[PDB]
Amino acid sequence: QSAQEILDRVEKNLSTPWQATVQGRIEEELLARVYALPQARLFRVEFLKPGSLEGNFTVITEKEVWNYLYLTNQLVISPQVDLRLEGEVRLPEGMAWKLVGRSQGFAAMELYILKADPRPLRFVFLDEKGKVLADLKVVEFKRTNLTEAQLKRYPKDAQVVRR
Numbered sequence: 001q002s003a004q005e006i007l008d009r010v011e012k013n014l015s016t017p018w019q020a021t022v023q024g025r026i027e028e029e030l031l032a033r034v035y036a037l038p039q040a041r042l043f044r045v046e047f048l049k050p051g052s053l054e055g056n057f058t059v060i061t062e063k064e065v066w067n068y069l070y071l072t073n074q075l076v077i078s079p080q081v082d083l084r085l086e087g088e089v090r091l092p093e094g095m096a097w098k099l100v101g102r103s104q105g106f107a108a109m110e111l112y113i114l115k116a117d118p119r120p121l122r123f124v125f126l127d128e129k130g131k132v133l134a135d136l137k138v139v140e141f142k143r144t145n146l147t148e149a150q151l152k153r154y155p156k157d158a159q160v161v162r163r
Contacts, residue, residue: 002085003099006113013118014038017146024123024136037146044151059152068154075158081109088115096121106133 019035031049036042043060047053055070067076083101090096091112099111110124119141125134 003083003101006085006097006099006118007083009118010113010120016143018141018143019146020138020142021140022136023139024134025132026134026136030136035146035151037148037151040148040151042146042148042151059154066154068158073155073157073159074161075154076161076163078163083109083111091121093121 014036015038017035017037017039019033021031021033023029023031028050030053031047032053033046033048035044035046041062044057045060046057047055052071057068059066059068063079065078067078068074069076081101081103083099086098086100088095089098089112091114093114095115097113097115099113100108101111102108106125107128108126110122110126111120112122113119114121120138122137123134124132124136127133
């Protein structure tokens with residue numbers, strides 16, 4: 001239940017607008033910028049790496065999800081883990097809580113949460129043998145101000161694929 005308390009602290013601590021840089025491996029390198037405007041229930045992810053995703057972006061709202069595919073100029077419009085607190089570990093950003101949980105494309109995961117300023121720092125997904133399937137780190141983070149005009153922007157010439 002301690003994990004739930006931590007997650008609750010994170011949710012409350014990130015109730016204002018923020019942005020971050022996510023980098024890791026999934027083998028290929030994944031790099032993206034993330035934007036959140038909680039009060040408007042808006043989220044945007046912009047991809048930088050790998051080459052197949054470079055330029056793509058995803059916009060999430062309470063109602064629908066937009067997935068822009070840069071190379072094909074298509075805008076696709078479409079309508080859990082039992083985490084437990086294992087303990088703490090010192091990370092570059094400082095002391096963090098290490099949450100662990102079992103269980104559909106992975107066997108278990110590790111979620112690292114910064115203690116001083118409750119927010120995610122790293123997500124690690126493991127298979128049955130403990131092999132890393134994905135290791136994504138939040139390498140940059142900043143609280144800021146964002147607007148719907150910014151997060152809902154899209155290429156005017158995008159071709160719509162409506163699900």
